[PDB]
A paper describes a structure:
The isocitrate dehydrogenases (IDHs) compose a family of enzymes that catalyze the sequential dehydrogenation and decarboxylation of isocitrate to α-ketoglutarate (αKG) in the mitochondria or the cytosol. Hence, [name] plays an important role in reactive oxygen species (ROS) removal in the mitochondria or the prevention of age-related diseases. We have previously shown that under calorie restriction (CR), [name] deacetylase Sirt3 deacetylates and activates [name] in mouse cochlea. In this CR-mediated pathway, we have shown that mIDH2 activity was regulated by its acetylation/deacetylation state.
To better understand which lysine acetylation sites regulate mIDH2 activity, we created a series of lysine-to-glutamine (KQ) mutations to mimic the acetylated states in mIDH2 in vitro. Importantly, we solved the crystal structure of an acetylation mimic of mIDH2 ([name] mutant). On the other hand, the structure of the [name] mutant was solved at 2.3 Å resolution and belonged to space group P32. The isocitrate molecule, Mg2+ ion, and the binding residues overlapped well in the wild-type enzyme and the [name] mutant. However, the regions involving N-terminal residues 40‒145 and C-terminal residues 329‒451 in the large domain of the [name] mutant were closer to the isocitrate-binding pocket. Compared to wild-type mIDH2, the [name] mutant had a smaller binding pocket, which was observed in the surface view of the structures. In contrast to the wild-type subunit A and B volumes of 3304 and 4244 Å3, respectively, the [name] mutant subunit A and B volumes were 2895 and 3135 Å3, respectively. The surface electrostatic potential of both structures showed that substitution of Lys256 to Gln led to the presence of fewer positive charges. Concordantly, the lysine-to-glutamine (KQ) substitution, mimicking acetylated states, could neutralize the positive charge, resulting in a narrower cleft and a smaller isocitrate-binding pocket. Furthermore, the shortened distance enabled Gln256 to form hydrogen bonds with the carbonyl groups of Pro118 (2.5 Å) and Trp132 (3.7 Å), which eventually enhanced the conformational change.
Residue numbers in the entry:
A (entry chain A): 42 to 450
B (entry chain B): 42 to 451
Amino acid sequence: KRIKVEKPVVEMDGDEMTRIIWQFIKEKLILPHVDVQLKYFDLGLPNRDQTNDQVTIDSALATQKYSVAVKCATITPDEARVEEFKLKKMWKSPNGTIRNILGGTVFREPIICKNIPRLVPGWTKPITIGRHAHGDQYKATDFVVDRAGTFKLVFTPKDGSSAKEWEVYNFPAGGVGMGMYNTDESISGFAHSCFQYSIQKKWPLYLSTKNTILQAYDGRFKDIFQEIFDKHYKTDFDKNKIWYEHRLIDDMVAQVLKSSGGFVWACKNYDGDVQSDILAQGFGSLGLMTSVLVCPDGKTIEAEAAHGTVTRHYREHQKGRPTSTNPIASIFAWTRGLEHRGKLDGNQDLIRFAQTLEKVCVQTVESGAMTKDLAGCIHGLSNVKLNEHFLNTTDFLDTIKSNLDRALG
Amino acid sequence: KRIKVEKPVVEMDGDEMTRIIWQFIKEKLILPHVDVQLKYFDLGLPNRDQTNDQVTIDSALATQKYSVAVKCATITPDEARVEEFKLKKMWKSPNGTIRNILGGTVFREPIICKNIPRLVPGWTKPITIGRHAHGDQYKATDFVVDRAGTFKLVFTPKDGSSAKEWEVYNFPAGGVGMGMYNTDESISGFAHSCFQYSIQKKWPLYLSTKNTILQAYDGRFKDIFQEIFDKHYKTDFDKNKIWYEHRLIDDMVAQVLKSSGGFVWACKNYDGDVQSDILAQGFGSLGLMTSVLVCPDGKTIEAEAAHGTVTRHYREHQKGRPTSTNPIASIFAWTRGLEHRGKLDGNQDLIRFAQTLEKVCVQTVESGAMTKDLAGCIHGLSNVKLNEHFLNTTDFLDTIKSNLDRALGK
Ligand SMILES: [Mg+2]
Ligand SMILES: [Mg+2]
């Protein structure tokens, strides 16, 4: 019997090869077991252009309403994509837009498969990055200086007090300038979520900044975290034999590499983007990773596939040929979506299905049935072969489907 | 008989554990075998405070004059350091101030010992990071927003063109803002350095940015590198079977961790700081890495230890507790300083001494005498033990001192 879900799930469609596997996953794994009401938004690049990127804002507003989104990987366009898709604007990142509106922390962690070898031998336990999802480089204003001139910052107070101007630089010739920001509210919510997840895991927490160089900007991150820790969380950290410490970013990453894992890592928005990929790759593969935005309100989430759209595999699919594409991150976006939908509704049957599918995915890879990229981690890309070391995208999903049916019975 | 050194070498002194190691090296390893005139500048935090940070500017000026600096790792103040040292102001990064005056690229690579298992087993060849030494976070203007108000950017052209304003954010409550920049001239020189270094090494080059998010700012880096590649280097890269590619920083770092090395990695100022510590640590230790600021003119350099002051080892050493800090990167700052001084003057004995001291360091570790960090790579950090697997800071330095005297004795 299919599990009845009462409240809706927001579904965000994607691009190229991820768009196609997103549909297979829905057909083969999700819908045959779950009767769920889907609130569809096409964040494919053609439709984002068609709606002047308004579909992206509505998908986020819908997520605030219904409290659970699941997202397919999308194209953030450059010059090349603007020419290829004939876009009228170089539209901003859908991910950055959705994260800004919703706010909160993007938690990312590996999907550990026993047989997929780590590139960092020392990491015996997993690590979780809490990436702050708001502000900084993902809400910056930047520009090209094409001639001599003065660049300055200006802060005009609301209360009526005098404006403060800072002369940033008197450009003699061309260059670039940018401004970015963040709020106390956004940093406080970011801190709270990280402290709570650390208690939940029984793991210590590390904040990373460069407050020696950005003494006001990064110092505020250090100050707010240490304030919230002292007043709200120090007692709960002591009871669980865990701690909190601020580290300089360059010191942190070395320490992380030397570690054995088993900690939470609060990263700034930019650092989260960079270091989550070092984490994913170090644990075995970029495709073996979850990514879940947890909003400040505690109720709303957005689960996503954090990787790209796999353009090379898509081109082959256009020419009627078979591909071998890892669907696990996309699968885990659905399960994390459905699990939280089940938590809010009090639907234990749904929660159990999501966890069962996550386990079946790992077991299928651990049994030796896998896609080309994962088989390449084991035997090397030069030594792998079809129906010997790896399977087609749909065949792997069909293997996952068979194992999912056996587990449920 | 000391080696006479005709011309001076600028010396920048530092803080905490590196300051103590710096003085051992100067006193006991360098000037008993090298008659060298040192233009001494104390960039220890108390003297920077004493001089209103002018000594930092004066050290940078002196490096331009004599073309060679050797620097000890320094403290950059935050709020805690103002309390600690009772500072007049929250002074800026002296490395920032030095790098901004001198300009150039900071080249960073591992110091390889056959004896030391990597944390990243895949990296069978070394990797060099060309770090851009100018602009971005290290020249930024940042501030605390402590009341409601609007933050904007304003560009006013010098020759009468229309001025442009951009609203960054309307703050309802408290927060933070910042503005930063870089220049076409600085980024072009950064490209030239990295392309030239790549052709020397016969290695491919990668530039990392986030041009998909920072369309203008990071796009400018991508465009200038590509123009300069096609105008000056593309032919030579193709002839030498090497290549240049741009990659998104997040894509790049994953590629690095999975690679087997053998490439140059052009990093922006911020990225180069973070990624150079990943690199040193992955090859074995923060103590086994060189760092050289190569200026545009092709003559001036500043050699340093990439790693910090080792504050956590300094707190133990202050209270008399056991300590084992790796001095090799700090020694290699002296040797690359002297080697370059020797190369400029045509002083062959001074070049040989520098290289002899580098061989002594590597052969000392390769013979089984080492500091804790390196012992941990072999035996595991949770099983190493004082005087069984590793030596003290002083006992390891005395071992370098003993082996050095024996080396040039032979
Ligand atoms: Mg990323
Ligand atoms: Mg550093």
